[PDB]
C-alpha cells in the first residue's frame, strides 16, 4: 500500500537513507530507503534531505572506484554501482516520481547467456543474498541493471523469486523518475569459487567460503522449483561447437567398460527440468569442458565428473568444474582427460574471432599459434590462441580415456550405498591447569592437564588428540606436542624460575583442528 | 507453537548466513542458533536444512567467526559457536525458545561514557537499521558478562524491548534456542582505536561523517524529551579535577560576554545533561569520557579540551577526531598545561589510578612528555593523565582566541551539504601537418539541477601504453591539445568534473582517439 502524497512528502523532506556493510566496495551490500532512479539518465539518485544517512560516508573516495560491485565479479570496472546526488528540494524541478511498489534487490547479471556464469555469478549469489535479509526472499522483486535482454536462461532467474524480475530496459516504461521506498543493492560473493582471469590467469578463488552443502541446499531448492523429485552414465553433448567427434564409439565403450547404461543429453534439445532430472540420478557425468558442466552441482553425492579437454588445453589451467567437484562437502570424484594427439583434433581457423578463428590475425601469429602445443597462460577474455584451441572438435582416444578414468574410479562409479556424515570441529579444551617442580639449577618439570571440549561430551569421535604449544614467555620460539592423553609432564629444556605459555587445542580424526583455549601461564 | 519449533530445530538444524569476507567486518543472520547456559557456548546444530555461510573449516578459529564488539580483532571479544549434530538434542534438556528476534553483541566497557557511545550505542543504532524489522522488533542480548553498568538507561533507549544480559539468559533455562538472531555490530560509525597494537589515535579510514552522528543524536534527544547564550564547563568531581574552577568560570564569562554554566554527570539526569550541551555555544572540559557529549553540541559550537601536564594533545585525540569530523561543524581547541607548578601528581593512589622501582619512578617525574605507548596499563601514562591541574587562564584564553575570533557558537553561520558532480556526458573527441586533438563534453546530469559557485573539469591526456598522463584543469567544456600531440598515436582522454576545488566527481568512460 502507498499513500502517494504522504510518500512524496517523506521523500522530499527527509531524502534518501543508506546503510551498507563492508569496508571495501568489493565486500559491500547496501540497504536504501527512498533511492531514486532517472530512467532518462540511467542514473541512481541519492536525495539529500533532513533525515538522510550515508554509511559509509566516503566523500571523494566514493569514486575510488565506486560504492560497490554490482555483479559478483570482483572489482570489474564496467560492473560498478554508484549514484548521483541532488538536494531533495530539487524534486520541485523534476517530474513527479513513480513509486516502485515492491521491495527491490538490485544487481548486475554478469554473463546471462552462459549457463555457468548464470549459476555461479548470479543464481547462487541471488539465492543467498535474498536470505541475508529478513523478508526479501518472499517480498523482493529482482531488478537486473546490466543492460542485457532476458537471455537464454531467463526462466531460471524466474525460479528465484515469486515476482517477475524486471530489466533495466523495462524501467523507462514505468516512468521518467522512479523511487524505491525500500531497495537492497549488491550481491554477496560468499558462494563464488572461480575467478575468470581479469588480473591474473583464471583459476580457483583464493579463499573459498562455500562448501558443497550450501551448493546442494540451493540445488535442492531449484529441483523443487523445477518439479524434479537402472544406474547410468550420462554424456553431456554439445551440438554446435566443441564437439566429441566419436560420440557413438564413446557411449558403447563406456557401457562396456563400466557395465552400465550410457545415455546422452544436451542443453539445446531438452527442457532444463529434464536435464536436471537426468543429471540428478546419474552415476557419472562425461563432458567437454564447457558451461553445461555447471550442472555437475546437481549430481548425487559420490558420482564422478569426467571432464575432457581439447588438444593443447592443459586441464590444470581451466579448473572451474574441477574446483566445484572437489569442493569440501560436494563429494564428487573428478577426472580430467586431455587430447594429446594432434591427429584427433579438428581446427576451425576461418570462423569469426568469437568462435576461435584466427584468419584475422597476422600470418606470423597464425603460424605461431598453429605450431604451439599448449595454450600459454593468458588474461580474460579474447586471447586468440585460447579461443582457437577451446573451439576445436575432438576425436576422443577411448583407451586412454578409460585408463585415465580407472585411476580414480576403482570399480563401480557413483554412490554405491555410501553414507555421508558432516565433519565438525572440537570446541576448546576446558579448565586447563599446570604445576611445576624443580630438581636442580637446569632441571624442572611442567605438568599440564585439561578437560575435554564441551561438545565432545555429546559426540563419539574415532580419534581424539590434543596439540600443545609450549613457549617460553620471552621467546618467539614454540614447541608443539601431539598427545593422546588429557595431561602431560614436559621435561626437555624446562628451567626453574621461568614462565611458560601453554596453548592447547583438540583435533578430531587428524584433520579437524579445533580452537586454542585461552593461554595458560605457568611459572616454574 | 513449541512442537513445530522443536521439530524444525531437530530435523533442520541451525542456519547461518553472514556478510563480509573477514571476521573483522562480519555480520551474521542465524535461525535456530542455540546456547548452553552452563557451558556459555553458542551451539550450531547440524541438521538436514543447515547452511553455514561462510563455511570456513578450521579457519573458523583463525581467530574466530566475527568480532562481537566493535573493537577490531580484540582477542577477548570474539564470537564463535561449537558444533553438534541436531540428533545430540536427545542428550539434552528440552530447549527454551527465545521468540523475539535477537541482536547479540558485546559491550566493550559499559562503565565508560565514551566507550558506551562510540563502541556500542552508535554501532547498535545503525546495525539495527542494517536489517529490516530489527529496529522496531529486536531484543538486545549483551553477552560480554558485565552487569547493567552506569549507563544502562542509554542502552534501553535503543530498543522498545528490554535488553537482556548474559546472566538473565542462564536463568531462562539450561538450553536456549533463538528462532531468529543477528550477531555482531558494524564498525562503520567508529572513529577511534584504543592502541592495542599501535599507539591510540584516529581510525585509519573513517567511514562516518558528522551528519550520521547528528542523526543518531537527534534520535537520542527525542527519546530523552529534549528539543540566554551560554558557555558550558563540564566538571569532573572525583578525579582529574580543574582546581581554579570559579576563576575559570568568571574569566570565561567576562572575556566572551556570556553566561557560564557548570555541568556534571553525577549531579544531573542525563536528559538534562544533553539539554545543556545541546544548546551550548562552547563546551570546556578536561580530557575524559564526558567529552563524548560534544556530539550533542549545535553546529558551529566550540570544543575546548584541557590536557594535564606532560600529556600531549596530539597523542590522545578521540574528542578532537569527533569534533573535526567532516560534517560535525565544531571548532576544536586543545590546551595543554606546560607549567609544573599547576600540576598535582598523585603517586600515592593505587595502581588502578596510577609501587614500582624508585629507579623507574625517578624517570617518571623526570619526563616532560608521556612517551607513545600501547594499551592498556601504562603507569607512566596513568600517572600523568590522572593528575589534577590548575588552569593558567591567560594562556588558555589566548589559545582559544587563536581559533575563536569574536564570539563563539553558531552566530550567523549556515552550513550546506557538499554534493559531488556526476560524470560528464556525451564526451567526444576529434583528431586532425601538425597533429592536434580536440575534446568536448556536456555537463553532468545532476548539474542541470544545481547552482554551484565554481565548476571545473580535470582532464588527463594519456598516450596508449603509457602508465602516466598530462593533467589539465579547465573551465570550458572543450579543449584543443597542442603541446604533447604526435601523429599516428592513440590517446586516452579522461574527464572529471570538480565542484568548488575539492569535490572531485567520477571520471566518465574514457575517450579513445587516434591521430
Amino acid at each position: 500500500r502507498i499513500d502517494y502524497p504522504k510518500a512524496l512528502q517523506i521523500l522530499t523532506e527527509g531524502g534518501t537513507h543508506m546503510v551498507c556493510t563492508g569496508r571495501t566496495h568489493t565486500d559491500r551490500l547496501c540497504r536504501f530507503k527512498w533511492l531514486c532512479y532517472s530512467s532518462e539518465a540511467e542514473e541512481f539518485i541519492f536525495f539529500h534531505g533532513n533525515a538522510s544517512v550515508m554509511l559509509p560516508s566516503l566523500g571523494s573516495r566514493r569514486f575510488q572506484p565506486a560504492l560497490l560491485d554490482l555483479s559478483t565479479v570482483e572489482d570489474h570496472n564496467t560492473q560498478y554501482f554508484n549514484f548521483v546526488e541532488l538536494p531533495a528540494a530539487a524534486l520541485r524541478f523534476m517530474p513527479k516520481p513513480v513509486f516502485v511498489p515492491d521491495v527491490a534487490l538490485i544487481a548486475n547479471r554478469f554473463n546471462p547467456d552462459n549457463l555457468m556464469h548464470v549459476f555461479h555469478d548470479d543464481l547462487l549469489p541471488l539465492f543467498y543474498t535474498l536470505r541475508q535479509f529478513p523478508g526479501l526472499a518472499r517480498e523482493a522483486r529482482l531488478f537486473f541493471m546490466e543492460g542485457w535482454g532476458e537471455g537464454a536462461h531467463f526462466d531460471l532467474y524466474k525460479l528465484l523469486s515469486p515476482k517477475q524480475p524486471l530489466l533495466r530496459a523495462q524501467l523507462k516504461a514505468l516512468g521518467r523518475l522512479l523511487c524505491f521506498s525500500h531497495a537492497f543493492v549488491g550481491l554477496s560473493k560468499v558462494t563464488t569459487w572461480y575467478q575468470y582471469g581479469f588480473v591474473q590467469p583464471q583459476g580457483p578463488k583464493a579463499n573459498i567460503l562455500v562448501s558443497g552443502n550450501e551448493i546442494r541446499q540451493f540445488a535442492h531448492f531449484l529441483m523443487e522449483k523445477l518439479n524434479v523429485s537402472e544406474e547410468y552414465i550420462l554424456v553431456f553433448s554439445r551440438t554446435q561447437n566443441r564437439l566429441i567427434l566419436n560420440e557413438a564409439e564413446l557411449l558403447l565403450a563406456l557401457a562396456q567398460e563400466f557395465q552400465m547404461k550410457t545415455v546422452t543429453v544436451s542443453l539445446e534439445d531438452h527442457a532444463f527440468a529434464d536435464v536436471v532430472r537426468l543429471v540428478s540420478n546419474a552415476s557419472m557425468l562425461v563432458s567437454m569442458h564447457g558451461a553445461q558442466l555447471v550442472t555437475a552441482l546437481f549430481l548425487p553425492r559420490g558420482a564422478a565428473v569426467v571432464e575432457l579437454f581439447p588438444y593443447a588445453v592443459n586441464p590444470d589451467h581451466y579448473t572451474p568444474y574441477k574446483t566445484l567437484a572437489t569442493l569440501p562437502g560436494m563429494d564428487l570424484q573428478y577426472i580430467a582427460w586431455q587430447n594429446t594427439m594432434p591427429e584427433n583434433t579438428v581446427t576451425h581457423p576461418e570462423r569469426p574471432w568469437d568462435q576461435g578463428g584466427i584468419a584475422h590475425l597476422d600470418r606470423a601469429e597464425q603460424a605461431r599459434i598453429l605450431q604451439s602445443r599448449e595454450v600459454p597462460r593468458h588474461l580474460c577474455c579474447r586471447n586468440p590462441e585460447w579461443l582457437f584451441r577451446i573451439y576445436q572438435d575432438t576425436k576422443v582416444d577411448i583407451p586412454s580415456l578409460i585408463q585415465t578414468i580407472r585411476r580414480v574410479v576403482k570399480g563401480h562409479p557413483g554412490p554405491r550405498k555410501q553414507k555421508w556424515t558432516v565433519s565438525l570441529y572440537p570446541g576448546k579444551v576446558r579448565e586447563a591447569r599446570c604445576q611445576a617442580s624443580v630438581q636442580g639449577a637446569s632441571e624442572a618439570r611442567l605438568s599440564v592437564s585439561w578437560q575435554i571440549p564441551w561438545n565432545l561430551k555429546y559426540l563419539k569421535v574415532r580419534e581424539v588428540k590434543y596439540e600443545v604449544w609450549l613457549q617460553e614467555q620471552g621467546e618467539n620460539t614454540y614447541v608443539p606436542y601431539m598427545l593422546a592423553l588429557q595431561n602431560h609432564t614436559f621435561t626437555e629444556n624446562i628451567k626453574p624460575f621461568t614462565t611458560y605459555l601453554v596453548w592447547i587445542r583438540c583435533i578430531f580424526n587428524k584433520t579437524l583442528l579445533g580452537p586454542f583455549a585461552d593461554v595458560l601461564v605457568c611459572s616454574t | 507453537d513449541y512442537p513445530k519449533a522443536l521439530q524444525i530445530l531437530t530435523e533442520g538444524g541451525t542456519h547461518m548466513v553472514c556478510t563480509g569476507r573477514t571476521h573483522t567486518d562480519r555480520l551474521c543472520r542465524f535461525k535456530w542458533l542455540c546456547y548452553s547456559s552452563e557451558a556459555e557456548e553458542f551451539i550450531f546444530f547440524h541438521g538436514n536444512a543447515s547452511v553455514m555461510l561462510p563455511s570456513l573449516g578450521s579457519r573458523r578459529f583463525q581467530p574466530a567467526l566475527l568480532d562481537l564488539s566493535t573493537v577490531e580483532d580484540h582477542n577477548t571479544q570474539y564470537f564463535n559457536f561449537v558444533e553438534l549434530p541436531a540428533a545430540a538434542l536427545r542428550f539434552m534438556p528440552k530447549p527454551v525458545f527465545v521468540p523475539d528476534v535477537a541482536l547479540i553483541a558485546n559491550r566493550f566497557n559499559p562503565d565508560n561514557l565514551m566507550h558506551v557511545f562510540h563502541d556500542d550505542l552508535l554501532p547498535l543504532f545503525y546495525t539495527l537499521r542494517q536489517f529490516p524489522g530489527l529496529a522496531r522488533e529486536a531484543r538486545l542480548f549483551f553477552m560480554e558478562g558485565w552487569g547493567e553498568g552506569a549507563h544502562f538507561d542509554l542502552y534501553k533507549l535503543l530498543s522498545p524491548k528490554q535488553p537482556l544480559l548474559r546472566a538473565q539468559l542462564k536463568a531462562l533455562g539450561r538450553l536456549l534456542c533463538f528462532s531468529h538472531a543477528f550477531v555482531g555490530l558494524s564498525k562503520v560509525t567508529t572513529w577511534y582505536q584504543y592502541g592495542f597494537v599501535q599507539p591510540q589515535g584516529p581510525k585509519a579510514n573513517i567511514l562516518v561523517s558528522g551528519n550520521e552522528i547528528r542523526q543518531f543524536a537527534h534520535f537520542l534527544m527525542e527519546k530523552l524529551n529534549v528539543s540566554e547564550e551560554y558557555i558550558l564547563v563540564f566538571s569532573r568531581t572525583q578525579n582529574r579535577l580543574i582546581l581554579n574552577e570559579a576563576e575559570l568560570l568568571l574569566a570565561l564569562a567576562q572575556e566572551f560576554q556570556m553566561k557560564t554554566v557548570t555541568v556534571s554527570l553525577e549531579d544531573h539526569a542525563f536528559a538534562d545533561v544533553v539539554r545543556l550541551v545541546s544548546n551550548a555555544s562552547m563546551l570546556v572540559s578536561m580530557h575524559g569520557a564526558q567529552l563524548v557529549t560534544a556530539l550533542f553540541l549545535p553546529r558551529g559550537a566550540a570544543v575546548v579540551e584541557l590536557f594535564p601536564y606532560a600529556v600531549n594533545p596530539d597523542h590522545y585525540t578521540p574528542y578532537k577526531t569527533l569534533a573535526t569530523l567532516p560534517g560535525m561543524d565544531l571548532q576544536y581547541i586543545a590546551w595543554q598545561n606546560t607549567m609544573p607548578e599547576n600540576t598535582v601528581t598523585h603517586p600515592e593512589r593505587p595502581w588502578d589510578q596510577g609501587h614500582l622501582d624508585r629507579a623507574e619512578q625517578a624517570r617518571i617525574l623526570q619526563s616532560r612528555e608521556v612517551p607513545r605507548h600501547l594499551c592498556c596499563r601504562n603507569p607512566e601514562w596513568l600517572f600523568r593523565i590522572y593528575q589534577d591541574t590548575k588552569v593558567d587562564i591567560p594562556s588558555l584564553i589566548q589559545t582559544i582566541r587563536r581559533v575563536v575570533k569574536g564570539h563563539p557558537g553558531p552566530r550567523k553561520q549556515k552550513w550546506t551539504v557538499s554534493l559531488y558532480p556526476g560524470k560528464v556526458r556525451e564526451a567526444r573527441c576529434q583528431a586532425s601537418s601538425e597533429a592536434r586533438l580536440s575534446v568536448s563534453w556536456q555537463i553532468p546530469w545532476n548539474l542541470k539541477y544545481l547552482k554551484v559557485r565554481e565548476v571545473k573539469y580535470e582532464v588527463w591526456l594519456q598516450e596508449q601504453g603509457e602508465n602516466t598522463y598530462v593533467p589539465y584543469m579547465l573551465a570550458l567544456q572543450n579543449h584543443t591539445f597542442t603541446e604533447n600531440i604526435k601523429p599516428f598515436t592513440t590517446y586516452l582522454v579522461w574527464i572529471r568534473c570538480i565542484f568548488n576545488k575539492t569535490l572531485l566527481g567520477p571520471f566518465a568512460d574514457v575517450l579513445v582517439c587516434s591521430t
Binding site: 564496467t78 | 602516466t468 586516452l492 571520471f507 568512460d509
Partner: peptide, 12 residues
C-alpha cells in the same frame, strides 16, 4: 560475450 574491462587509468 564476457564483459571485458575498460581501459585502466594510469597509476603513474
Amino acid at each position: 560475450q564476457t564483459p571485458t574491462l575498460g581501459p585502466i587509468q594510469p597509476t603513474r
